[PDB]
Design goal:
Distance between the termini of chain A: 32 Å
Bound molecules: potassium ion
Radius of gyration of chain A: 22 Å
Oligomer: homodimer
Keywords: thiocysteine lyase, polyketide synthase, natural product, sulfur incorporation., biosynthetic protein
PDB class: biosynthetic protein
Chains A, B: Polyketide Synthase Protein
Number of domains of chain A: 2
Structural class of chain A: alpha/beta
CATH topology of the largest domain in chain A: Aspartate Aminotransferase, domain 2
Largest sheet of chain A: 6 strands, mixed
Strand order of the largest sheet of chain A: 2-7-6-5-4-3
Number of strands of chain A: 13
Order of helices and strands of chain A: HEHEHEHHEHEHHEEHHHEHHEEEHEEH
CATH superfamily of the largest domain in chain A: Type I PLP-dependent aspartate aminotransferase-like (Major domain)
CATH architecture of the largest domain in chain A: 3-Layer(aba) Sandwich
Number of helices of chain A: 15
Assembly: dimeric
CATH class of the largest domain in chain A: Alpha Beta
Shape of chain A: globular
Entry title: Structure of the thiocysteine lyase (SH) domain from guangnanmycin A biosynthetic pathway
Chain lengths: ~425, ~400
């Protein structure tokens, strides 16, 4: 990869943490699939296409359209997924107790605490196999019943990011919903990547990709409320959605919208409306992304890059402990992220622990994992080139530079070239 | 600028930590023992040729017309020479009064049982700003009567920015030490530069520096040199004395522990001390190049401590970066200078607190390199952009740019 020198200067300007480099300066950004954090060239053409569709259908943008695949009478736009989470949590009518979740996205956890809920109980998952994100149904039973009458809702994120985008099966989600329904506990989905999960289920069942909508509607129908970040599956530059069957929750969501107004802006809402309605292009984009994740995975695995096994929706997890086996690094993920970026121009991000305790309250052993995420619209050829460079890097015998942290957005410095007294101090 | 920023970040945002060979223009020191500039190899070859032609043995420093000492000893470095002198000292060990001598002396004196806690003040202004305050010297000699092992004077004193002491002042100092029977020791590492500055101030030709140097050296009972500042050699030191008892102890220790540095180096040192013509040429050029560097910096509006000086200029950070506040002004400005210009200076903290950067010029450097450096420094001073603030990460500190630190990490 050319231009190592400029990348080393970029690392130096950003505390040797490639996550802090501006997206537009990164050669191949795989830190996130969120279009809200990206400005790739294909995003402009997509906005133009959706704005044209909005004009042709006379979409107003006033409120979310009725959608054949979304079985909810009460639908609300938000500025982002995390704003949609805030709207739901603020509007929640019932008493505020625990929220049991399958290691939900970190934006949820702060919002839940701020709004008076207790998200300290994370639900464990299968952790291996074809549906590695399946909830452990016995542990779900234990938590629901431990905390009988003290659980506000169960929150399930499909294609769970904390579990590397592994899918949960429709059978598993129906089993979760039988348990919540039996107890009168609401089920809430974080459906940001539910279409990718629905596609993975169709594919594991030997079914055409176009069946994803049937499975998706089945999954959505199990929930009493859902939230979406729209910028992961729907090819839009930002935006969120809340939907519910619960009349009381809907009343409170509506009254808050009256106090504060609708978000995002009208032109953006017309584009979100077009995206939600135009199933053919959401289907196209999602199917290609999942397929290109699998192609990227295969190119990596056949090049000897060790990965957490799939299948997965939107990303692969590179296992640094296996990729750099004899290299004792003080901060393995941080050092390897900087090393990958310097050598290849590919930017990944750190993958945090799911935060699920063992039987005895202990923490599971530490994992050193890098997430490489694939946005809708990315070219397979770019990913195959990236996999080839990553495989060359893993095959290279040079030692990885051992970064020291200044006591995902931490700052580091190399210790190699400093005096012995200073380096020992640091 | 890109590659320099990467280099700065790999060395704790402290240009003093970068290896000398990786610095574009190194002005951190004039010492050849800390440098490997291209001209050094050719100089060594020329001196080795001279040693061969003259059949020098390297066994002892040669007799020199300007060095009035019968007892002369090589050492591995200036600081080793200081150690040899202090270890051999036969007299009772008490206070050493010094004119803010080089830091290697202070540690060596303490380790050898001497007390260097009393520094002698200097004039600070006037024709010779580094001249010793003679009334203060008298007070100190009377206050510490019978408890002073020696008075230590460093010419062209680095702590005072390389300003010269006059021959008249050194004679007045030595008359006072003689009157009390207290030996005078000189750190003569840059005595030749001091002698040249005195010839200039007296309207005398530069070739008279050897006569002034001999006049100065002849006042002292013992002298030490780091040879790598004035003699165009890659390392080495010299101790000399008139004192028979000190000489016997230096000799005894040399017989127990052996001569230093190695023989080949000692022959090159001997050739350098003997070949006055090239030392005169290099020292005269260096002092003149400092003066030219100074003038060009002045022409560009770069604020400097006034001269004339031997081996360096002191850049005044308080005047060069007036305006918004820096937690570590010298460190931030050193980083700023290096990033923008490729010039590496060093901190000068020698004696309300002054923020000064030392830009030192080794023998052999080209004037065109200095004039280019001054022009780049002039442009940097003319730049209105605020200097990036640095935060220290807990001498020779490591830093991180303050704006890059999250609020948690800062606290
Ligand atoms: K993101
Ligand atoms: K847009
Ligand atoms: K967002
Ligand atoms: K250089
Ligand atoms: K040399
Ligand atoms: K001679």
């Amino acid at each position: 990869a050319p231009d190592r020198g400029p990348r080393l200067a970029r690392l130096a300007a950003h505390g040797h943490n490639p996550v802090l480099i501006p997206h537009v300066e990164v050669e191949l950004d795989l830190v996130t699939d969120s279009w809200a954090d990206r400005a790739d060239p294909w995003q402009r053409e997509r906005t133009r296409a959706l704005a044209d569709l909005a004009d042709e259908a006379g979409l107003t943008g006033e409120r979310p359209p009725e959608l054949p695949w979304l079985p909810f009478a009460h639908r609300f736009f938000a500025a982002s997924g995390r704003a949609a989470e805030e709207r739901l949590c603020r509007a929640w009518p019932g008493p505020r107790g625990r929220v049991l979740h399958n290691s939900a996205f970190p934006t949820w956890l702060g919002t839940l605490v701020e709004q008076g809920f207790d998200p300290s109980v994370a639900l464990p998952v299968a952790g291996a196999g074809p549906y590695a994100a399946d909830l452990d149904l016995d542990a779900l039973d234990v938590a629901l019943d431990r905390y009988a009458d003290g659980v506000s809702f169960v929150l399930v994120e499909t294609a769970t990011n904390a579990h590397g985008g592994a899918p949960l099966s429709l059978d598993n989600l129906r089993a979760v919903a039988r348990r919540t329904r039996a107890r009168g506990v609401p089920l809430v989905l974080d459906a940001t990547r539910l279409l990718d999960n629905a596609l993975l289920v169709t594919a594991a069942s030997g079914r055409p990709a176009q069946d994803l909508w049937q499975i998706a509607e089945d999954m959505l129908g199990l929930a009493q409320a859902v939230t979406f970040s729209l910028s992961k599956d729907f090819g839009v530059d930002g935006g969120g959605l809340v939907a519910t069957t619960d009349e009381r929750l809907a009343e409170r969501l509506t009254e808050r919208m009256l106090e504060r107004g609708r978000e995002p802006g009208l032109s953006a809402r017309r584009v979100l409306s077009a995206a939600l309605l135009h199933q053919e292009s959401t289907e196209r984009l999602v199917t290609r992304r999942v397929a290109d994740v699998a192609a990227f995975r295969q190119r990596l695995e056949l090049g000897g890059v060790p990965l957490v096994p799939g299948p997965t929706a939107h990303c692969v997890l590179l296992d640094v402990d296996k990729a750099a086996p004899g290299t004792p690094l003080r901060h393995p993920v941080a050092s390897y992220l900087s090393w990958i970026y310097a050598a290849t121009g590919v930017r990944g991000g750190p993958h945090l622990a799911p935060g699920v305790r063992l039987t005895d309250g202990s923490e599971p052993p530490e994992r050193h994992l890098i997430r490489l995420a694939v946005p809708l619209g990315m070219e397979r050829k770019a990913l195959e080139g990236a996999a080839d460079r990553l495989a060359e890097l893993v095959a290279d015998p040079a030692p990885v530079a051992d970064l020291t942290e200044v006591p995902a957005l931490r700052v580091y410095h190399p210790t190699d070239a400093l005096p012995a007294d200073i380096r020992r101090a640091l």
